Amino acid sequence: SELLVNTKSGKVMGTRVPVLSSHISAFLGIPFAEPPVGNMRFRRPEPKKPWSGVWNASTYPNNCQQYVDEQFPGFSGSEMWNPNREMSEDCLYLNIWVPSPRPKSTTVMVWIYGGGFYSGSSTLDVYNGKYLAYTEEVVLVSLSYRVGAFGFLALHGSQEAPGNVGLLDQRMALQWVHDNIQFFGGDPKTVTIFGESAGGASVGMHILSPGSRDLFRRAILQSGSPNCPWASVSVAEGRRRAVELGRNLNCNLNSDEELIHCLREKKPQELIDVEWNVLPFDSIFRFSFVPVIDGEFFPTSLESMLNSGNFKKTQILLGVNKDEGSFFLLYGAPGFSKDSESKISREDFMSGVKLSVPHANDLGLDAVTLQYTDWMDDNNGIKNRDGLDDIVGDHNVICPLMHFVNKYTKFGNGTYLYFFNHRASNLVWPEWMGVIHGYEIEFVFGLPLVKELNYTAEEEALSRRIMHYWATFAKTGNPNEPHSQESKWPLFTTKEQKFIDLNTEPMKVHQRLRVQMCVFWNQFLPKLLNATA
Ligand SMILES: CN(C)c1ccc(-c2sc3cc(O)ccc3[n+]2C)cc1
Ligand SMILES: *[C@@H]1O[C@H](CO)[C@@H](O)[C@H](O)[C@H]1NC(C)=O
Ligand SMILES: *[C@@H]1O[C@H](CO)[C@@H](O)[C@H](O)[C@H]1NC(C)=O
Ligand SMILES: *[C@H]1O[C@H](CO)[C@@H](O)[C@H](O)[C@H]1NC(C)=O
Ligand SMILES: [Mg+2]
Ligand SMILES: [Mg+2]
Protein backbone atom coordinates (compact mmCIF):
# COMPACT_ATOMS: atom_id res chain seq x y z
CA SER A 1 0.00 0.00 0.00
CA GLU A 2 1.79 3.06 -1.39
CA LEU A 3 -0.91 5.34 0.02
CA LEU A 4 0.32 4.66 3.54
CA VAL A 5 3.43 6.47 4.75
CA ASN A 6 5.09 6.87 8.14
CA THR A 7 6.84 10.16 8.86
CA LYS A 8 8.81 11.44 11.85
CA SER A 9 5.53 13.12 12.82
CA GLY A 10 2.97 10.38 12.29
CA LYS A 11 1.36 8.23 9.60
CA VAL A 12 -0.35 9.65 6.53
CA MET A 13 -3.07 8.02 4.45
CA GLY A 14 -2.86 9.41 0.93
CA THR A 15 -5.22 8.85 -2.01
CA ARG A 16 -4.87 7.56 -5.56
CA VAL A 17 -5.96 10.21 -8.07
CA PRO A 18 -6.46 10.26 -11.87
CA VAL A 19 -4.02 12.18 -14.01
CA LEU A 20 -4.43 12.10 -17.77
CA SER A 21 -5.56 8.49 -18.24
CA SER A 22 -3.30 7.28 -15.43
CA HIS A 23 -2.75 7.85 -11.69
CA ILE A 24 -0.38 8.97 -8.91
CA SER A 25 -0.43 9.23 -5.11
CA ALA A 26 -1.55 12.46 -3.46
CA PHE A 27 -1.11 13.50 0.15
CA LEU A 28 -3.12 16.64 0.81
CA GLY A 29 -3.12 18.54 4.10
CA ILE A 30 -0.10 17.04 5.82
CA PRO A 31 0.38 19.34 8.86
CA PHE A 32 3.93 20.57 9.52
CA ALA A 33 3.26 23.08 12.29
CA GLU A 34 1.08 23.58 15.37
CA PRO A 35 -2.03 25.70 14.67
CA PRO A 36 -0.86 29.33 14.92
CA VAL A 37 -4.15 30.12 16.65
CA GLY A 38 -5.01 32.04 19.79
CA ASN A 39 -1.94 32.92 21.81
CA MET A 40 0.13 31.67 18.84
CA ARG A 41 -1.08 34.45 16.49
CA PHE A 42 1.89 36.50 15.22
CA ARG A 43 4.36 34.26 17.07
CA ARG A 44 6.98 32.18 15.29
CA PRO A 45 5.74 28.75 14.27
CA GLU A 46 6.29 25.74 16.54
CA PRO A 47 6.58 22.21 14.99
CA LYS A 48 3.58 19.91 14.84
CA LYS A 49 3.65 17.62 17.90
CA PRO A 50 3.75 14.07 16.45
CA TRP A 51 0.20 12.74 16.14
CA SER A 52 -1.07 9.30 17.10
CA GLY A 53 -3.03 7.12 14.70
CA VAL A 54 -3.17 7.70 10.96
CA TRP A 55 -3.56 11.23 9.59
CA ASN A 56 -5.99 11.44 6.66
CA ALA A 57 -4.31 13.35 3.85
CA SER A 58 -6.83 12.81 1.07
CA THR A 59 -8.43 16.24 0.65
CA TYR A 60 -6.94 19.74 0.42
CA PRO A 61 -6.75 21.72 3.68
CA ASN A 62 -8.14 25.05 4.81
CA ASN A 63 -6.60 28.21 3.37
CA CYS A 64 -5.07 31.00 5.47
CA GLN A 65 -7.13 34.02 6.50
CA GLN A 66 -6.93 36.73 3.86
CA TYR A 67 -8.47 39.56 1.90
CA VAL A 68 -10.73 38.11 -0.80
CA ASP A 69 -10.96 39.81 -4.19
CA GLU A 70 -14.55 40.78 -4.99
CA GLN A 71 -13.84 43.42 -7.60
CA PHE A 72 -15.25 41.37 -10.45
CA PRO A 73 -17.86 38.95 -9.02
CA GLY A 74 -18.46 35.75 -10.99
CA PHE A 75 -15.44 36.53 -13.14
CA SER A 76 -13.17 33.47 -13.13
CA GLY A 77 -10.36 35.73 -14.31
CA SER A 78 -9.99 37.25 -10.86
CA GLU A 79 -11.73 34.59 -8.78
CA MET A 80 -9.24 31.90 -9.81
CA TRP A 81 -6.83 33.31 -7.20
CA ASN A 82 -9.37 33.57 -4.37
CA PRO A 83 -9.27 30.97 -1.58
CA ASN A 84 -11.21 27.88 -2.66
CA ARG A 85 -11.45 26.37 0.83
CA GLU A 86 -12.64 27.57 4.23
CA MET A 87 -10.38 30.34 5.46
CA SER A 88 -8.93 29.62 8.90
CA GLU A 89 -6.07 30.64 11.18
CA ASP A 90 -5.28 26.92 11.24
CA CYS A 91 -3.78 26.69 7.76
CA LEU A 92 -0.19 25.47 8.14
CA TYR A 93 -0.43 22.36 5.97
CA LEU A 94 1.33 21.14 2.83
CA ASN A 95 0.61 18.97 -0.23
CA ILE A 96 2.68 16.18 -1.79
CA TRP A 97 2.17 14.54 -5.19
CA VAL A 98 3.97 11.24 -5.70
CA PRO A 99 4.25 9.19 -8.92
CA SER A 100 3.19 5.54 -9.18
CA PRO A 101 4.90 3.33 -8.69
CA ARG A 102 6.55 5.37 -5.94
CA PRO A 103 10.13 6.07 -7.09
CA LYS A 104 13.06 6.48 -4.72
CA SER A 105 15.52 9.36 -4.28
CA THR A 106 13.83 11.36 -7.06
CA THR A 107 13.83 15.11 -7.66
CA VAL A 108 11.69 17.20 -5.33
CA MET A 109 10.10 20.53 -6.23
CA VAL A 110 8.51 22.71 -3.56
CA TRP A 111 6.12 25.41 -4.73
CA ILE A 112 5.67 28.68 -2.88
CA TYR A 113 2.54 30.53 -3.96
CA GLY A 114 2.56 34.30 -4.33
CA GLY A 115 -0.08 36.96 -3.81
CA GLY A 116 1.83 39.99 -2.59
CA PHE A 117 2.32 38.46 0.86
CA TYR A 118 -1.27 39.43 1.63
CA SER A 119 -3.09 36.60 -0.16
CA GLY A 120 -2.48 33.06 -1.37
CA SER A 121 -3.47 29.39 -1.38
CA SER A 122 -1.63 26.15 -2.05
CA THR A 123 -4.90 24.69 -3.32
CA LEU A 124 -5.73 26.79 -6.38
CA ASP A 125 -6.60 24.82 -9.50
CA VAL A 126 -3.54 26.36 -11.14
CA TYR A 127 -1.16 24.88 -8.51
CA ASN A 128 -2.28 21.27 -8.82
CA GLY A 129 0.98 19.35 -8.75
CA LYS A 130 -0.40 16.11 -10.16
CA TYR A 131 0.35 17.11 -13.76
CA LEU A 132 3.93 18.22 -13.17
CA ALA A 133 4.59 15.29 -10.85
CA TYR A 134 3.22 12.81 -13.38
CA THR A 135 4.76 14.20 -16.57
CA GLU A 136 8.31 14.67 -15.30
CA GLU A 137 8.27 12.08 -12.52
CA VAL A 138 9.18 14.27 -9.56
CA VAL A 139 7.79 14.71 -6.05
CA LEU A 140 6.01 18.05 -6.29
CA VAL A 141 5.33 19.73 -2.94
CA SER A 142 3.16 22.80 -2.38
CA LEU A 143 3.63 24.46 1.01
CA SER A 144 1.69 27.24 2.75
CA TYR A 145 2.51 30.19 4.98
CA ARG A 146 0.64 32.82 6.92
CA VAL A 147 -0.10 35.99 4.96
CA GLY A 148 -1.33 39.43 5.91
CA ALA A 149 -1.05 40.77 9.43
CA PHE A 150 -1.17 37.11 10.52
CA GLY A 151 2.16 36.33 8.91
CA PHE A 152 4.06 39.60 8.75
CA LEU A 153 2.83 42.05 11.40
CA ALA A 154 6.11 43.53 12.62
CA LEU A 155 6.78 45.17 15.98
CA HIS A 156 10.52 44.52 15.95
CA GLY A 157 11.82 44.23 19.49
CA SER A 158 9.01 41.99 20.67
CA GLN A 159 9.21 38.22 20.89
CA GLU A 160 5.47 37.82 20.45
CA ALA A 161 5.22 39.61 17.09
CA PRO A 162 8.77 39.76 15.59
CA GLY A 163 7.63 39.72 11.98
CA ASN A 164 8.78 37.54 9.07
CA VAL A 165 6.99 34.68 10.82
CA GLY A 166 5.40 34.01 7.44
CA LEU A 167 8.80 33.35 5.90
CA LEU A 168 9.37 31.18 8.95
CA ASP A 169 6.40 28.96 8.18
CA GLN A 170 7.84 28.34 4.70
CA ARG A 171 11.07 27.37 6.40
CA MET A 172 9.54 24.91 8.82
CA ALA A 173 7.84 23.43 5.78
CA LEU A 174 11.12 23.27 3.88
CA GLN A 175 12.52 21.73 7.06
CA TRP A 176 9.77 19.12 7.27
CA VAL A 177 10.16 18.20 3.60
CA HIS A 178 13.83 17.81 4.43
CA ASP A 179 13.31 15.24 7.18
CA ASN A 180 10.42 13.50 5.49
CA ILE A 181 10.30 13.71 1.70
CA GLN A 182 12.37 10.52 1.46
CA PHE A 183 9.61 8.34 2.87
CA PHE A 184 7.55 9.48 -0.13
CA GLY A 185 10.28 8.58 -2.58
CA GLY A 186 11.85 12.01 -2.49
CA ASP A 187 15.52 12.97 -2.37
CA PRO A 188 16.10 15.68 0.28
CA LYS A 189 19.40 16.52 -1.43
CA THR A 190 17.79 17.53 -4.72
CA VAL A 191 15.09 19.91 -3.54
CA THR A 192 14.31 22.91 -5.74
CA ILE A 193 12.14 25.76 -4.40
CA PHE A 194 10.03 27.66 -6.93
CA GLY A 195 7.46 30.43 -6.56
CA GLU A 196 5.89 33.31 -8.44
CA SER A 197 5.48 36.94 -7.39
CA ALA A 198 5.65 37.04 -3.58
CA GLY A 199 6.61 33.38 -3.96
CA GLY A 200 9.55 34.34 -6.14
CA ALA A 201 10.70 36.97 -3.68
CA SER A 202 10.28 34.27 -1.05
CA VAL A 203 12.57 31.85 -2.89
CA GLY A 204 15.15 34.60 -3.24
CA MET A 205 14.81 35.50 0.43
CA HIS A 206 15.57 31.92 1.33
CA ILE A 207 18.66 32.21 -0.89
CA LEU A 208 19.69 35.15 1.25
CA SER A 209 18.64 33.98 4.70
CA PRO A 210 21.41 31.84 6.33
CA GLY A 211 18.81 30.00 8.36
CA SER A 212 17.31 28.59 5.18
CA ARG A 213 20.26 28.12 2.84
CA ASP A 214 20.90 24.52 3.87
CA LEU A 215 17.33 23.44 3.19
CA PHE A 216 17.29 23.22 -0.64
CA ARG A 217 19.63 22.67 -3.63
CA ARG A 218 18.88 25.00 -6.55
CA ALA A 219 16.02 27.48 -7.09
CA ILE A 220 13.58 29.09 -9.53
CA LEU A 221 12.14 32.65 -9.39
CA GLN A 222 9.08 33.74 -11.44
CA SER A 223 8.06 37.44 -11.66
CA GLY A 224 9.44 38.35 -8.27
CA SER A 225 12.78 39.22 -6.72
CA PRO A 226 13.80 39.55 -3.05
CA ASN A 227 14.83 43.17 -3.51
CA CYS A 228 11.46 44.15 -4.96
CA PRO A 229 10.18 47.61 -3.86
CA TRP A 230 7.13 45.91 -2.40
CA ALA A 231 8.80 42.83 -0.94
CA SER A 232 9.87 44.39 2.36
CA VAL A 233 9.98 47.32 4.77
CA SER A 234 12.33 48.63 7.41
CA VAL A 235 11.79 47.74 11.05
CA ALA A 236 10.74 51.34 11.47
CA GLU A 237 8.14 51.31 8.71
CA GLY A 238 6.90 47.92 9.90
CA ARG A 239 6.45 49.13 13.44
CA ARG A 240 4.62 52.21 12.16
CA ARG A 241 2.17 50.12 10.17
CA ALA A 242 1.90 47.76 13.14
CA VAL A 243 0.83 50.57 15.46
CA GLU A 244 -1.33 51.97 12.67
CA LEU A 245 -3.39 48.76 12.48
CA GLY A 246 -4.02 48.97 16.21
CA ARG A 247 -5.03 52.62 15.99
CA ASN A 248 -7.48 51.48 13.29
CA LEU A 249 -9.03 49.03 15.74
CA ASN A 250 -9.05 51.28 18.79
CA CYS A 251 -6.21 49.48 20.56
CA ASN A 252 -4.09 50.46 23.53
CA LEU A 253 -1.00 51.81 21.77
CA ASN A 254 1.13 52.54 24.85
CA SER A 255 3.21 49.32 24.76
CA ASP A 256 3.88 46.46 22.37
CA GLU A 257 2.44 44.01 24.85
CA GLU A 258 -0.83 45.94 25.00
CA LEU A 259 -1.03 46.26 21.21
CA ILE A 260 -0.42 42.53 20.74
CA HIS A 261 -3.21 41.58 23.17
CA CYS A 262 -5.66 43.83 21.35
CA LEU A 263 -4.81 42.54 17.90
CA ARG A 264 -5.11 38.99 19.25
CA GLU A 265 -8.62 39.50 20.66
CA LYS A 266 -9.87 40.84 17.31
CA LYS A 267 -11.48 38.47 14.82
CA PRO A 268 -9.53 37.65 11.62
CA GLN A 269 -11.97 39.61 9.54
CA GLU A 270 -11.71 42.66 11.84
CA LEU A 271 -8.00 42.80 11.02
CA ILE A 272 -8.49 42.12 7.33
CA ASP A 273 -11.11 44.82 6.87
CA VAL A 274 -8.65 47.57 7.79
CA GLU A 275 -5.50 45.92 6.45
CA TRP A 276 -5.15 48.41 3.62
CA ASN A 277 -5.51 51.51 5.82
CA VAL A 278 -1.90 51.32 7.04
CA LEU A 279 -0.18 51.83 3.67
CA PRO A 280 1.58 55.22 3.81
CA PHE A 281 0.46 56.31 0.35
CA ASP A 282 -2.40 56.04 -2.12
CA SER A 283 -0.92 53.60 -4.60
CA ILE A 284 -0.72 50.37 -6.54
CA PHE A 285 1.54 47.31 -6.24
CA ARG A 286 2.11 47.99 -2.53
CA PHE A 287 0.94 45.82 0.33
CA SER A 288 0.75 46.43 4.08
CA PHE A 289 2.33 43.49 5.89
CA VAL A 290 5.44 42.06 4.24
CA PRO A 291 8.97 40.86 5.16
CA VAL A 292 10.87 43.18 7.50
CA ILE A 293 14.64 43.80 7.31
CA ASP A 294 15.07 42.57 10.91
CA GLY A 295 18.76 41.93 11.34
CA GLU A 296 18.20 38.27 12.11
CA PHE A 297 16.41 36.49 9.23
CA PHE A 298 18.20 39.06 7.12
CA PRO A 299 21.74 39.54 8.58
CA THR A 300 22.22 42.93 6.93
CA SER A 301 20.60 45.05 4.18
CA LEU A 302 19.58 43.26 1.00
CA GLU A 303 21.83 45.30 -1.31
CA SER A 304 24.77 44.69 1.02
CA MET A 305 24.16 40.96 1.17
CA LEU A 306 23.94 40.79 -2.64
CA ASN A 307 26.99 43.02 -3.21
CA SER A 308 29.18 41.00 -0.86
CA GLY A 309 27.94 37.61 -2.04
CA ASN A 310 26.59 36.77 1.40
CA PHE A 311 24.06 34.21 0.12
CA LYS A 312 23.66 30.54 -0.93
CA LYS A 313 25.52 30.05 -4.20
CA THR A 314 24.02 27.57 -6.67
CA GLN A 315 22.19 27.37 -10.01
CA ILE A 316 19.03 29.47 -10.39
CA LEU A 317 16.43 29.77 -13.15
CA LEU A 318 14.30 32.94 -13.27
CA GLY A 319 12.32 35.25 -15.55
CA VAL A 320 9.55 37.79 -16.10
CA ASN A 321 6.42 38.30 -18.21
CA LYS A 322 5.88 40.86 -20.95
CA ASP A 323 3.23 42.92 -19.11
CA GLU A 324 3.79 42.68 -15.35
CA GLY A 325 1.92 45.91 -14.62
CA SER A 326 -1.43 45.59 -16.40
CA PHE A 327 -3.03 43.59 -13.56
CA PHE A 328 -2.39 46.18 -10.90
CA LEU A 329 -3.25 49.11 -13.12
CA LEU A 330 -6.69 47.56 -13.76
CA TYR A 331 -7.49 47.29 -10.05
CA GLY A 332 -6.30 50.65 -8.78
CA ALA A 333 -5.46 53.09 -11.59
CA PRO A 334 -7.83 55.65 -13.13
CA GLY A 335 -8.91 55.25 -16.72
CA PHE A 336 -8.53 51.50 -16.89
CA SER A 337 -11.46 49.22 -17.53
CA LYS A 338 -12.02 45.53 -18.10
CA ASP A 339 -14.75 46.37 -20.64
CA SER A 340 -12.71 48.48 -23.08
CA GLU A 341 -9.18 48.89 -24.40
CA SER A 342 -8.48 51.49 -21.67
CA LYS A 343 -6.98 54.31 -23.74
CA ILE A 344 -5.45 56.45 -20.99
CA SER A 345 -5.77 60.23 -21.09
CA ARG A 346 -2.90 62.58 -20.33
CA GLU A 347 -4.49 63.67 -17.06
CA ASP A 348 -5.08 60.07 -15.96
CA PHE A 349 -1.50 59.16 -16.95
CA MET A 350 -0.06 61.71 -14.55
CA SER A 351 -2.35 60.26 -11.89
CA GLY A 352 -1.30 56.73 -12.77
CA VAL A 353 2.35 57.64 -12.53
CA LYS A 354 2.02 59.07 -9.01
CA LEU A 355 0.14 55.92 -7.98
CA SER A 356 3.07 53.83 -9.19
CA VAL A 357 5.94 55.62 -7.46
CA PRO A 358 4.23 56.93 -4.28
CA HIS A 359 7.55 57.49 -2.52
CA ALA A 360 8.66 59.82 -5.30
CA ASN A 361 8.90 63.59 -4.93
CA ASP A 362 7.53 65.91 -7.59
CA LEU A 363 10.85 65.98 -9.43
CA GLY A 364 11.07 62.19 -9.38
CA LEU A 365 7.63 61.97 -10.95
CA ASP A 366 8.78 64.35 -13.69
CA ALA A 367 11.84 62.20 -14.31
CA VAL A 368 9.53 59.21 -14.66
CA THR A 369 7.17 60.98 -17.07
CA LEU A 370 9.94 62.37 -19.26
CA GLN A 371 11.50 58.92 -19.37
CA TYR A 372 8.31 57.18 -20.46
CA THR A 373 6.52 59.86 -22.52
CA ASP A 374 6.64 60.29 -26.30
CA TRP A 375 6.51 64.02 -26.91
CA MET A 376 5.83 63.44 -30.60
CA ASP A 377 2.55 61.75 -29.70
CA ASP A 378 1.73 62.44 -26.02
CA ASN A 379 -2.05 62.30 -26.44
CA ASN A 380 -1.99 58.79 -27.90
CA GLY A 381 -4.24 56.93 -25.46
CA ILE A 382 -2.64 53.62 -26.38
CA LYS A 383 0.89 54.78 -25.70
CA ASN A 384 -0.03 56.13 -22.28
CA ARG A 385 -1.77 52.87 -21.42
CA ASP A 386 1.23 50.77 -22.39
CA GLY A 387 3.48 53.35 -20.82
CA LEU A 388 2.01 52.71 -17.40
CA ASP A 389 2.17 48.97 -17.96
CA ASP A 390 5.93 49.27 -18.51
CA ILE A 391 6.32 51.71 -15.66
CA VAL A 392 4.56 49.53 -13.13
CA GLY A 393 6.24 46.47 -14.64
CA ASP A 394 9.81 47.68 -14.77
CA HIS A 395 9.69 49.45 -11.38
CA ASN A 396 7.97 46.61 -9.53
CA VAL A 397 9.24 43.46 -11.25
CA ILE A 398 11.56 43.39 -14.28
CA CYS A 399 14.22 45.88 -13.18
CA PRO A 400 14.39 44.60 -9.60
CA LEU A 401 14.79 41.03 -10.87
CA MET A 402 17.40 42.33 -13.31
CA HIS A 403 19.38 44.01 -10.56
CA PHE A 404 19.23 40.69 -8.70
CA VAL A 405 20.27 38.61 -11.71
CA ASN A 406 23.48 40.58 -12.17
CA LYS A 407 24.31 40.87 -8.47
CA TYR A 408 23.70 37.11 -8.19
CA THR A 409 25.58 36.06 -11.33
CA LYS A 410 28.81 37.20 -9.67
CA PHE A 411 29.04 34.50 -7.03
CA GLY A 412 26.54 31.93 -8.29
CA ASN A 413 27.21 28.69 -10.17
CA GLY A 414 24.91 29.25 -13.13
CA THR A 415 22.03 31.45 -14.28
CA TYR A 416 19.19 30.90 -16.74
CA LEU A 417 17.00 33.90 -17.60
CA TYR A 418 13.71 33.87 -19.53
CA PHE A 419 11.15 36.25 -21.03
CA PHE A 420 7.67 34.71 -21.00
CA ASN A 421 5.68 36.50 -23.70
CA HIS A 422 2.96 34.08 -24.80
CA ARG A 423 -0.63 35.29 -24.69
CA ALA A 424 -2.84 32.31 -23.78
CA SER A 425 -5.60 31.44 -26.26
CA ASN A 426 -8.34 31.04 -23.65
CA LEU A 427 -7.36 34.03 -21.53
CA VAL A 428 -10.53 35.52 -20.04
CA TRP A 429 -9.05 39.01 -19.53
CA PRO A 430 -9.09 41.85 -22.12
CA GLU A 431 -6.45 42.10 -24.81
CA TRP A 432 -4.69 45.29 -23.76
CA MET A 433 -3.75 43.44 -20.61
CA GLY A 434 -1.46 41.28 -22.77
CA VAL A 435 0.68 38.65 -21.03
CA ILE A 436 -0.49 39.27 -17.48
CA HIS A 437 1.42 38.97 -14.23
CA GLY A 438 1.24 35.46 -12.82
CA TYR A 439 -0.30 33.97 -15.97
CA GLU A 440 2.77 31.97 -16.88
CA ILE A 441 2.07 29.66 -13.94
CA GLU A 442 -0.60 27.58 -15.63
CA PHE A 443 2.04 26.50 -18.12
CA VAL A 444 4.66 25.67 -15.50
CA PHE A 445 2.10 23.35 -13.91
CA GLY A 446 1.01 21.75 -17.17
CA LEU A 447 -2.63 22.81 -17.12
CA PRO A 448 -2.54 23.10 -20.92
CA LEU A 449 -2.11 19.31 -21.15
CA VAL A 450 -5.76 19.09 -20.09
CA LYS A 451 -8.07 18.82 -23.09
CA GLU A 452 -11.15 20.07 -21.20
CA LEU A 453 -9.32 23.31 -20.42
CA ASN A 454 -9.53 24.04 -24.14
CA TYR A 455 -5.90 24.94 -24.95
CA THR A 456 -4.50 24.95 -28.49
CA ALA A 457 -2.26 22.05 -29.56
CA GLU A 458 0.72 24.40 -29.69
CA GLU A 459 0.11 25.57 -26.14
CA GLU A 460 0.31 22.00 -24.83
CA ALA A 461 3.59 21.93 -26.69
CA LEU A 462 4.90 24.97 -24.83
CA SER A 463 3.61 23.78 -21.46
CA ARG A 464 5.36 20.42 -21.96
CA ARG A 465 8.52 22.21 -23.05
CA ILE A 466 8.50 24.51 -20.02
CA MET A 467 7.79 21.71 -17.57
CA HIS A 468 10.82 19.91 -18.95
CA TYR A 469 13.18 22.88 -18.68
CA TRP A 470 11.91 23.40 -15.12
CA ALA A 471 12.08 19.82 -13.85
CA THR A 472 15.26 19.14 -15.84
CA PHE A 473 16.82 22.15 -14.10
CA ALA A 474 15.84 20.98 -10.61
CA LYS A 475 17.38 17.59 -11.35
CA THR A 476 20.54 18.72 -13.16
CA GLY A 477 21.06 22.45 -12.57
CA ASN A 478 20.63 22.99 -16.33
CA PRO A 479 17.34 23.16 -18.32
CA ASN A 480 18.89 21.90 -21.56
CA GLU A 481 19.03 18.24 -22.58
CA PRO A 482 22.33 16.35 -22.00
CA HIS A 483 22.97 16.19 -25.74
CA SER A 484 19.97 16.86 -27.95
CA GLN A 485 19.86 18.76 -31.24
CA GLU A 486 17.20 21.03 -29.76
CA SER A 487 18.36 24.63 -29.44
CA LYS A 488 20.04 25.28 -26.10
CA TRP A 489 18.97 27.84 -23.50
CA PRO A 490 22.15 29.92 -23.15
CA LEU A 491 23.68 30.39 -19.72
CA PHE A 492 23.28 33.94 -18.42
CA THR A 493 26.61 35.70 -17.98
CA THR A 494 27.71 39.09 -16.69
CA LYS A 495 29.36 39.75 -20.05
CA GLU A 496 26.77 38.68 -22.63
CA GLN A 497 23.64 38.67 -20.42
CA LYS A 498 21.75 36.30 -22.67
CA PHE A 499 18.15 35.20 -22.07
CA ILE A 500 15.48 33.43 -24.06
CA ASP A 501 11.78 34.12 -24.47
CA LEU A 502 9.14 31.51 -23.69
CA ASN A 503 6.35 31.24 -26.24
CA THR A 504 5.12 28.99 -29.04
CA GLU A 505 7.58 30.03 -31.76
CA PRO A 506 11.11 28.55 -32.00
CA MET A 507 13.50 29.78 -29.28
CA LYS A 508 15.32 33.10 -29.79
CA VAL A 509 18.31 34.32 -27.80
CA HIS A 510 18.22 37.97 -26.77
CA GLN A 511 20.62 40.15 -24.82
CA ARG A 512 20.35 42.71 -22.01
CA LEU A 513 16.72 42.59 -20.83
CA ARG A 514 15.26 46.11 -20.69
CA VAL A 515 18.76 47.32 -19.94
CA GLN A 516 17.86 50.91 -20.90
CA MET A 517 14.79 51.47 -18.73
CA CYS A 518 16.43 49.54 -15.93
CA VAL A 519 19.40 51.89 -15.72
CA PHE A 520 16.79 54.50 -14.91
CA TRP A 521 15.22 52.50 -12.09
CA ASN A 522 18.32 50.97 -10.56
CA GLN A 523 20.58 53.96 -10.83
CA PHE A 524 19.35 57.40 -11.82
CA LEU A 525 15.95 57.73 -10.15
CA PRO A 526 17.14 56.34 -6.82
CA LYS A 527 20.15 58.65 -7.09
CA LEU A 528 17.84 61.59 -7.81
CA LEU A 529 15.33 60.79 -5.09
CA ASN A 530 18.09 60.53 -2.47
CA ALA A 531 19.89 63.75 -3.44
CA THR A 532 16.57 65.64 -3.57
CA ALA A 533 14.57 64.73 -0.44
C1 LIG B 1 -4.99 39.64 -8.54
N1 LIG B 1 -4.12 40.83 -8.38
C2 LIG B 1 -2.85 40.84 -9.14
C3 LIG B 1 -4.52 41.94 -7.48
C4 LIG B 1 -5.76 41.85 -6.76
C5 LIG B 1 -6.16 42.88 -5.86
C6 LIG B 1 -5.36 44.06 -5.62
C7 LIG B 1 -5.87 45.14 -4.60
S1 LIG B 1 -4.78 46.52 -4.38
C8 LIG B 1 -5.82 47.24 -3.20
C9 LIG B 1 -5.59 48.47 -2.50
C10 LIG B 1 -6.58 48.90 -1.54
O1 LIG B 1 -6.40 50.18 -0.76
C11 LIG B 1 -7.76 48.11 -1.30
C12 LIG B 1 -7.98 46.89 -2.00
C13 LIG B 1 -7.05 46.40 -2.97
N2 LIG B 1 -7.01 45.25 -3.77
C14 LIG B 1 -8.11 44.24 -3.73
C15 LIG B 1 -4.11 44.19 -6.35
C16 LIG B 1 -3.69 43.13 -7.28
C1 LIG C 1 -10.64 11.07 5.47
O1 LIG C 1 -10.34 9.67 5.57
C2 LIG C 1 -11.53 8.86 5.71
C3 LIG C 1 -11.07 7.44 5.94
O2 LIG C 1 -11.13 7.10 7.31
C4 LIG C 1 -12.40 9.01 4.46
O3 LIG C 1 -13.57 8.22 4.60
C5 LIG C 1 -12.78 10.47 4.26
O4 LIG C 1 -13.50 10.62 3.05
C6 LIG C 1 -11.52 11.36 4.23
N1 LIG C 1 -11.88 12.77 4.16
C7 LIG C 1 -13.03 13.23 4.68
C8 LIG C 1 -14.27 13.18 3.79
O5 LIG C 1 -13.10 13.72 5.81
C1 LIG D 1 30.03 25.43 -10.90
O1 LIG D 1 31.00 24.82 -10.02
C2 LIG D 1 31.81 23.83 -10.70
C3 LIG D 1 32.64 23.11 -9.64
O2 LIG D 1 32.85 23.91 -8.49
C4 LIG D 1 32.66 24.51 -11.77
O3 LIG D 1 33.48 23.55 -12.42
C5 LIG D 1 31.74 25.18 -12.79
O4 LIG D 1 32.52 25.97 -13.68
C6 LIG D 1 30.71 26.09 -12.10
N1 LIG D 1 29.70 26.46 -13.07
C7 LIG D 1 29.48 27.74 -13.34
C8 LIG D 1 28.86 28.06 -14.70
O5 LIG D 1 29.75 28.64 -12.55
C1 LIG E 1 -13.83 23.94 -22.39
O1 LIG E 1 -14.22 24.91 -21.39
C2 LIG E 1 -15.62 24.90 -21.03
C3 LIG E 1 -15.82 25.96 -19.96
O2 LIG E 1 -16.51 25.44 -18.83
C4 LIG E 1 -16.05 23.49 -20.62
O3 LIG E 1 -17.37 23.51 -20.10
C5 LIG E 1 -15.98 22.56 -21.83
O4 LIG E 1 -15.58 21.25 -21.43
C6 LIG E 1 -15.03 23.10 -22.93
N1 LIG E 1 -15.81 23.85 -23.90
C7 LIG E 1 -16.34 23.23 -24.95
C8 LIG E 1 -17.48 22.24 -24.69
O5 LIG E 1 -15.96 23.42 -26.10
MG1 LIG F 1 -8.49 43.35 25.94
MG1 LIG G 1 2.89 46.42 -22.44
Swiss-Prot record:
Catalytic activity: acetylcholine + H2O = choline + acetate + H(+)
Gene name in the database record: ache
Activity regulation, per record: Inhibited by substrate concentrations above 0.5 mM.
Native organism taxonomy: Eukaryota, Metazoa, Chordata, Craniata, Vertebrata
Subunit structure: Isoform H form is a homodimer; the asymmetric form is a disulfide-bonded oligomer composed of a collagenic subunit (Q) and a variable number of T catalytic subunits.
Enzyme Commission number: 3.1.1.7
Reported tissue expression: Found in the synapses and to a lower extent in extrajunctional areas of muscle and nerve, and on erythrocyte membranes.
Record note on modification: An interchain disulfide bond is present in what becomes position 593 of the T isoform.
Short name of one Pfam family: COesterase
The UniProt record lists the keyword Lipoprotein: yes
CDD domains for this protein: Esterase_lipase
Active site annotation, chain numbering: 197, 324, 437
One of the GO BP terms on file: acetylcholine catabolic process in synaptic cleft
InterPro entries listed in its UniProt record: AB_hydrolase_fold, AChE-related_enzymes, Acylcholinesterase_fish/snake, CarbesteraseB, Carboxylesterase_B_AS, Carboxylesterase_B_CS, Cholinesterase
UniProt-annotated glycosylation sites, renumbered to this chain: 56, 413, 454, 530
Function: Terminates signal transduction at the neuromuscular junction by rapid hydrolysis of the acetylcholine released into the synaptic cleft. May be involved in cell-cell interactions.
Effect of residue 197 to C: Loss of activity
PROSITE patterns xref list: CARBOXYLESTERASE_B_1, CARBOXYLESTERASE_B_2
A GO molecular function held by the record: acetylcholinesterase activity
Keywords tagged on the record: Cell membrane, Disulfide bond, Glycoprotein, GPI-anchor, Hydrolase, Lipoprotein, Membrane, Neurotransmitter degradation, Serine esterase, Signal, Synapse
Protein name (record): Acetylcholinesterase
UniProt record similarity statement: Belongs to the type-B carboxylesterase/lipase family.
Disulphide linkage map: 64-91, 251-262, 399-518
GO CC annotations, alphabetized: extracellular space; plasma membrane; side of membrane; synapse; synaptic cleft
